[PDB]
Amino acid sequence: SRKTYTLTDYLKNTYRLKLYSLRWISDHEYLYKQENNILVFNAEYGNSSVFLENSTFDEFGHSINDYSISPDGQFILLEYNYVKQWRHSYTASYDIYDLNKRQLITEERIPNNTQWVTWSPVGHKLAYVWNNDIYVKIEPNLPSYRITWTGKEDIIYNGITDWVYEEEVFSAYSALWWSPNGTFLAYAQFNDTEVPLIEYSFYSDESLQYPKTVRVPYPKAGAVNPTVKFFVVNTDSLSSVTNATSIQITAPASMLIGDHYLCDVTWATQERISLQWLRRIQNYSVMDICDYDESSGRWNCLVARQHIEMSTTGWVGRFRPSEPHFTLDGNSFYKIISNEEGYRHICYFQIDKKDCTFITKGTWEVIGIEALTSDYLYYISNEYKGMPGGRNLYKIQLSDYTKVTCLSCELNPERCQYYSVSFSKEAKYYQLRCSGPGLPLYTLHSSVNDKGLRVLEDNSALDKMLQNVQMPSKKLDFIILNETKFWYQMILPPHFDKSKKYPLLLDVYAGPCSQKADTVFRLNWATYLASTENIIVASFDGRGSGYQGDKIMHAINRRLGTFEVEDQIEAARQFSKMGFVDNKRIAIWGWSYGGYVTSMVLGSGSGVFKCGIAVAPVSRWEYYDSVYTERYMGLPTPEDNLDHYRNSTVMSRAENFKQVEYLLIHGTADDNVHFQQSAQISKALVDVGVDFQAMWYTDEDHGIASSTAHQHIYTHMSHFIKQCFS
Amino acid sequence: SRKTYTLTDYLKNTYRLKLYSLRWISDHEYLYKQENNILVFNAEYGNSSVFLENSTFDEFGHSINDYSISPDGQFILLEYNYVKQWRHSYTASYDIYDLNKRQLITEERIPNNTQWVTWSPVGHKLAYVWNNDIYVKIEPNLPSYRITWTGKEDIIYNGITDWVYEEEVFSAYSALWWSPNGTFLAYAQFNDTEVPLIEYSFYSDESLQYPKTVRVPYPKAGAVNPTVKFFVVNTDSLSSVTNATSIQITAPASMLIGDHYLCDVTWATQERISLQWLRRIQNYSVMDICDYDESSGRWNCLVARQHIEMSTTGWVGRFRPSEPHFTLDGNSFYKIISNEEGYRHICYFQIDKKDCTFITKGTWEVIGIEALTSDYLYYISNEYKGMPGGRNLYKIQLSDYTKVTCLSCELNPERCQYYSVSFSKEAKYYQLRCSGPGLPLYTLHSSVNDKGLRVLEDNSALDKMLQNVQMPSKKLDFIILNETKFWYQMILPPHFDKSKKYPLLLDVYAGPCSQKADTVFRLNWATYLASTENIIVASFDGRGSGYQGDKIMHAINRRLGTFEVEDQIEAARQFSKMGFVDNKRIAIWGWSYGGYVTSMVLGSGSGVFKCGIAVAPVSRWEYYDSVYTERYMGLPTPEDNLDHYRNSTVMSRAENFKQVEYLLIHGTADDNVHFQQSAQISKALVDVGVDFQAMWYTDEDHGIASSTAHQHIYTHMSHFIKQCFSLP
Numbered sequence A: 001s002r003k004t005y006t007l008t009d010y011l012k013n014t015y016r017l018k019l020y021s022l023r024w025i026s027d028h029e030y031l032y033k034q035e036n037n038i039l040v041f042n043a044e045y046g047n048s049s050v051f052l053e054n055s056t057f058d059e060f061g062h063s064i065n066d067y068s069i070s071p072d073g074q075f076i077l078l079e080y081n082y083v084k085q086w087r088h089s090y091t092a093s094y095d096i097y098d099l100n101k102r103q104l105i106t107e108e109r110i111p112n113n114t115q116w117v118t119w120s121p122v123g124h125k126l127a128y129v130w131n132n133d134i135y136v137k138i139e140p141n142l143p144s145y146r147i148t149w150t151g152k153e154d155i156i157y158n159g160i161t162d163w164v165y166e167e168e169v170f171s172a173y174s175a176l177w178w179s180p181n182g183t184f185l186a187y188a189q190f191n192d193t194e195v196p197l198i199e200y201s202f203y204s205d206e207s208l209q210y211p212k213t214v215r216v217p218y219p220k221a222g223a224v225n226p227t228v229k230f231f232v233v234n235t236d237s238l239s240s241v242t243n244a245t246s247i248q249i250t251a252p253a254s255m256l257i258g259d260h261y262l263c264d265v266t267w268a269t270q271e272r273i274s275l276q277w278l279r280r281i282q283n284y285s286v287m288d289i290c291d292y293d294e295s296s297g298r299w300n301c302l303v304a305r306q307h308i309e310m311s312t313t314g315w316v317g318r319f320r321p322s323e324p325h326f327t328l329d330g331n332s333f334y335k336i337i338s339n340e341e342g343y344r345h346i347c348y349f350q351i352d353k354k355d356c357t358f359i360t361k362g363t364w365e366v367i368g369i370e371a372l373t374s375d376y377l378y379y380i381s382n383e384y385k386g387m388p389g390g391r392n393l394y395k396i397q398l399s400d401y402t403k404v405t406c407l408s409c410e411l412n413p414e415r416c417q418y419y420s421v422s423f424s425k426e427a428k429y430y431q432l433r434c435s436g437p438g439l440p441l442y443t444l445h446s447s448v449n450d451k452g453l454r455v456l457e458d459n460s461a462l463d464k465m466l467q468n469v470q471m472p473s474k475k476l477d478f479i480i481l482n483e484t485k486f487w488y489q490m491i492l493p494p495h496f497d498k499s500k501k502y503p504l505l506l507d508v509y510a511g512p513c514s515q516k517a518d519t520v521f522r523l524n525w526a527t528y529l530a531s532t533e534n535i536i537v538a539s540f541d542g543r544g545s546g547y548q549g550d551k552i553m554h555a556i557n558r559r560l561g562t563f564e565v566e567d568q569i570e571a572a573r574q575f576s577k578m579g580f581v582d583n584k585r586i587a588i589w590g591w592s593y594g595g596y597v598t599s600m601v602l603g604s605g606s607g608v609f610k611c612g613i614a615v616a617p618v619s620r621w622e623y624y625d626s627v628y629t630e631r632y633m634g635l636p637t638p639e640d641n642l643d644h645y646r647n648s649t650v651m652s653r654a655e656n657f658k659q660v661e662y663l664l665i666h667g668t669a670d671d672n673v674h675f676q677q678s679a680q681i682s683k684a685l686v687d688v689g690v691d692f693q694a695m696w697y698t699d700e701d702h703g704i705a706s707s708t709a710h711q712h713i714y715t716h717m718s719h720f721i722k723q724c725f726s
Numbered sequence B: 001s002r003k004t005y006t007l008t009d010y011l012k013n014t015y016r017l018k019l020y021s022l023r024w025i026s027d028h029e030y031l032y033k034q035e036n037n038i039l040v041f042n043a044e045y046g047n048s049s050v051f052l053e054n055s056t057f058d059e060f061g062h063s064i065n066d067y068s069i070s071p072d073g074q075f076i077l078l079e080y081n082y083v084k085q086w087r088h089s090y091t092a093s094y095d096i097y098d099l100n101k102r103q104l105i106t107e108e109r110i111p112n113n114t115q116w117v118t119w120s121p122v123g124h125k126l127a128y129v130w131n132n133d134i135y136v137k138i139e140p141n142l143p144s145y146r147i148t149w150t151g152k153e154d155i156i157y158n159g160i161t162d163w164v165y166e167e168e169v170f171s172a173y174s175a176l177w178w179s180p181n182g183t184f185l186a187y188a189q190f191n192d193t194e195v196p197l198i199e200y201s202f203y204s205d206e207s208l209q210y211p212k213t214v215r216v217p218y219p220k221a222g223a224v225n226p227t228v229k230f231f232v233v234n235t236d237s238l239s240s241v242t243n244a245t246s247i248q249i250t251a252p253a254s255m256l257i258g259d260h261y262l263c264d265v266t267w268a269t270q271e272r273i274s275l276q277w278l279r280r281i282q283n284y285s286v287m288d289i290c291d292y293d294e295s296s297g298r299w300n301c302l303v304a305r306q307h308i309e310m311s312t313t314g315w316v317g318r319f320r321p322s323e324p325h326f327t328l329d330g331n332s333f334y335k336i337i338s339n340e341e342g343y344r345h346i347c348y349f350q351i352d353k354k355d356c357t358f359i360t361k362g363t364w365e366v367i368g369i370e371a372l373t374s375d376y377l378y379y380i381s382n383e384y385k386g387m388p389g390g391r392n393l394y395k396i397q398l399s400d401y402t403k404v405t406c407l408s409c410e411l412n413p414e415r416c417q418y419y420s421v422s423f424s425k426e427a428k429y430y431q432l433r434c435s436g437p438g439l440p441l442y443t444l445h446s447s448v449n450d451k452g453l454r455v456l457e458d459n460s461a462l463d464k465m466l467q468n469v470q471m472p473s474k475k476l477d478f479i480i481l482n483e484t485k486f487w488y489q490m491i492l493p494p495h496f497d498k499s500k501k502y503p504l505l506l507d508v509y510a511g512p513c514s515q516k517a518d519t520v521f522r523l524n525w526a527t528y529l530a531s532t533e534n535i536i537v538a539s540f541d542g543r544g545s546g547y548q549g550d551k552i553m554h555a556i557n558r559r560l561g562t563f564e565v566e567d568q569i570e571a572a573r574q575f576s577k578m579g580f581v582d583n584k585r586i587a588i589w590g591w592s593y594g595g596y597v598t599s600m601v602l603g604s605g606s607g608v609f610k611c612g613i614a615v616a617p618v619s620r621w622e623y624y625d626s627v628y629t630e631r632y633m634g635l636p637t638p639e640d641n642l643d644h645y646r647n648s649t650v651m652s653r654a655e656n657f658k659q660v661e662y663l664l665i666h667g668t669a670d671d672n673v674h675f676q677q678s679a680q681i682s683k684a685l686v687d688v689g690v691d692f693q694a695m696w697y698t699d700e701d702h703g704i705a706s707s708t709a710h711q712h713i714y715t716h717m718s719h720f721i722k723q724c725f726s727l728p
């Protein structure tokens, strides 16, 4: 009766999860990029109007992939010729459509191959980067103003990040920040002069006779890191007669003493900017609050106005120090920091007062500050029912920290335990996005009384689609190890009979601050493996795991490849001793960090896993990037942590692979975890005489996400797993 | 009751074929390495007489890879710190040991990382190439004269070949030729300045934090080729001038008009040198004969003395124009060329006479000319019993061409049908090397009457060890294709039973002038497949194959990837119909060119093959080198042969791979068939959604001959094949 969720279903995405992506343009309205045309919705009433026809740009001559409407509403930025680079970076061509005259600006147009572009926060100003230099257009048709002249491919980056700052710290390519009203344009400058280059071959189309060598400045663990500078430009004060004057904000001295990073930049007021710096030993970070000097034109960062944030048990922040959220007058701010008990909560600061006051506390953590009004502080956390894998939106009254209200917990407890949110400009409204455990639900609410205005998408189409199929169930629970409870989840085959013994696949990530046991609803590989193959797919959040306090997360500090891999093993043993698990058919697989862990596990000699698959894994921390690696491993030097660097490689575990069936996968164009990492595992396995399976994906990167590659890799892994299990 | 030849036996080399390596030092004497002490045997009787004892090189603190004794036997060159480069090239450490004073020369030592070293043919002169420049040492202990000053890594090569010339023309790294007197040192100079670079990653050992990018001047099809120059220096005048002057030998005019290659160099006499040159369009070739003008001190090459050699049906020579063998006075020579019937035979030439006279028969071919005396000419051919896969030594009367004597045919016809030979200084004696079908057999003979003097090695040892194990047999025969018979070979499992159906594996090479069906005895992977897994391992020589005349070898001219692929398929169809072959279990596998073919076969959609394995295959000719590729495909231009270059790729047949199990394998550091070729193959398979198996070998080259990689690759392919055949 009915059918199972198949591999073809997954790969051909026959069952689509409908989302509702809206972009707020005001505090009252938002744009909804429909399928054809872009409509505008009035948050309040519910009355809609078209913003621009789907046909508007037919004969444009080019295929547009994105639109960026200025905060003015007068102009529209048209982005095309999109060419992907790293995880966030890319180059493209842009055209400016005038919504007034309804024409396409044609003079002083934006350069092809533009690296980054951004409207100012209010008018119709423009800042963009081309050839690594920054340019500014006060008005769409006026000439661009060369702000910087030092740009130089792979050497100096102005307004954009280099590889490591893109991936590991800013999580963005952009490196410019407009002041609130658009007067000032702040930017960072990266210098990779002495940073070593990673080199790999890119084969490109068949037509290319000779392979090309891709070279990108990339600091591996302990190498020379790029250096950084920060600057501020007064866009209201630049002419066409003289070059723009960039005012540099330097230091702090405690930082200039050695290698450091610029980890955060947030504007406080029209004339106040906050900068957060991080030492290379990500133990210490300092936040500076600099003000603009009127009768001097410089920016002053008064000490006494700076805040120190450190950690004695590990690094600062989950992945980096948090972002402060300033109040109206920008004289105080809120930001998530670690408790005296190791739990991350919101702390209240006065820009000139050292000791902050925690406004939340408990044995749970605030995931993020979502919106700040003079009245309430809105945030998401996992406090609800003590489930670290859940997410709910809360609002705390700033006058009385005792008055905290959960805005999502009870909306529909059965179907929703994992929320995210999108607030309007002044947080007058907000879209709640429930992504599990039931089907994704998008609703719209008004902040005044926290009333539900209307459902935006309840995925009723999918619900009618799936009632047809034999869907797997999900169990989210925990086991107790040495005083602590550790969560895990299991994707269970339909008509799960605890009387039968099911093969089990351990799906791992397990990197620092990772979470794999959650209440999110998904349609993926594991769905198919459980539904069609009758395989139980489990995940476990052990030591090093995130969102449960520092005692847990910092357990692997300076000790990667130890407790997290052991807990993964220990957890499988427990599952294997549950009765419905076929102990002779347990497998393990991981992508990225999961690939590394999956590998360390297979080479651990545990005796638990028959087989395992590792996709684009790290094999030795000295091959991975500095910023990420060093944040947990310190420096690869004898004076520091060289011994563990050398003790935690997969290759040194090669002999132990003689006991398992291993599949090793990696894209040859992986700019993140270099093919080199898997190239060294394969060689160690060969030198020690271990047979195993292998698969390279030419020209694919860490995501192996091209459509065909994606279908190919999961089809291949599927065959491996069934062979190992039948 | 009884065992077999296992995978372990192959990988661990449990059963070893004994050899007998002689190194003639005179007309009646040779040296025989006893793994510990070299001895000098007297061909006449078989005397001992140690030359260098067991432990003469202890306290040397270095492992001597090889040795080379000066012609006058007064010095011995020692080679160590070996470091492989390409297929023939390598860098090494050298030291010279004075036998007269039993001392080691410590002064003026040869530099470490020397690219090549050679004693002069007489006496003890030395010439070596270091840092791409040529050096000469008149005496081992004296300072060396630098001959050239332009050597520049990856740019200018003096006395040594660039990548393409080493691989595809000279099958050697050396590019210097001593005159038979030792008076002149001739050498080539290659310029790679404008040649594109193949670039690929080398990961090295774990310790290397950042991968290395190896860059090598390597011209792919149609790309800019390296240029060449030829010079000659008189070493006996090095001690009278100051800066030695290398006399250049240019032209031939019909060559300089465009792209060309230095083809061959052979000294005729003490002051007569012969050079063969070839056009990039390899169907035209010219030999140039130059005499040393002792007056001008130059080399005058009479244009009237030039010899053209061309082909109307294909390229020239098997892989290149053949080598000339000059008579004692240099006024005449013997050279193998294909006759009007398309069969390669020997013809006699006079330096002053463009028309040559053929001295050997018809429907078979002379493999090579082995020796020349005033009396007879010795050569090897496959004329015996009309088996193109056999090899015998014959001698023909120079004064009467109808007097031809086979010297090895009947020595032991049942055990020996594949011979190679090694004559002494004046061909007064010669060693015969029987390679199959029976266990190798080495014997010494004397040329006066071709009388067998004695058996040098008969492998009686291996023989004993094998009578206890179930060894496979080898069927060598032919099938018929379009009125013409083509040979094949089959490695049959023990106690073969024609009634049972055996799975079959087609082992293919099938490149231009290839031969996979022969009378050679081998202990390889196929031995194990047959002896242990009971798999019939066959090889077929179809159109394009060699040693059977141009009609067959030139059939795929300008048409690579067509008939040769088809024939491989047609042969399997015939094998499947044979009755003792299991129709549903026929696999195919090949390495190199055979990888290309295997991949082309699997992508043909003939439905004949269940699975296949391609190791380091070519995927499209534009990716391969110019010299080898263009020789058979012409240039990749619309004016020439671009259309077939595009119609003969593996990728364009990706879709058909859906009906077969394919194992693609390749070394990441393959400087010959770049990893790129397989990288493009997998991408095309991924793009059409076909699943396959893959395996890359880190830092391994085209030979994947690393001890561990070798064991690992064969181990990997065994699992794949017996899995495809449902063994185990």
Ligand SMILES: C[C@H](CCc1ccc(C(N)=O)cc1)NCC(=O)c1ccc(F)cc1
Pocket: A167, A168, A509, A511, A591, A592, A593, A594, A596, A617, A618, A628, A672, A673
């Ligand atoms: C920007 C990202 C964010 C952190 C992150 C996210 C997801 C995984 C994850 N799913 O494993 C691992 C680590 N870091 C670099 C990265 O992608 C990475 C780190 C470590 C590694 F072994 C592979 C890749």
Ligand SMILES: C[C@H](CCc1ccc(C(N)=O)cc1)NCC(=O)c1ccc(F)cc1
Pocket: B167, B168, B509, B511, B591, B592, B593, B594, B595, B596, B617, B618, B628, B672, B673
């Ligand atoms: C120096 C060699 C000598 C001729 C040769 C020998 C063996 C094979 C053979 N076993 O396939 C193919 C060709 N040619 C270049 C070469 O290595 C080559 C040619 C074509 C190809 F597809 C791969 C490699």
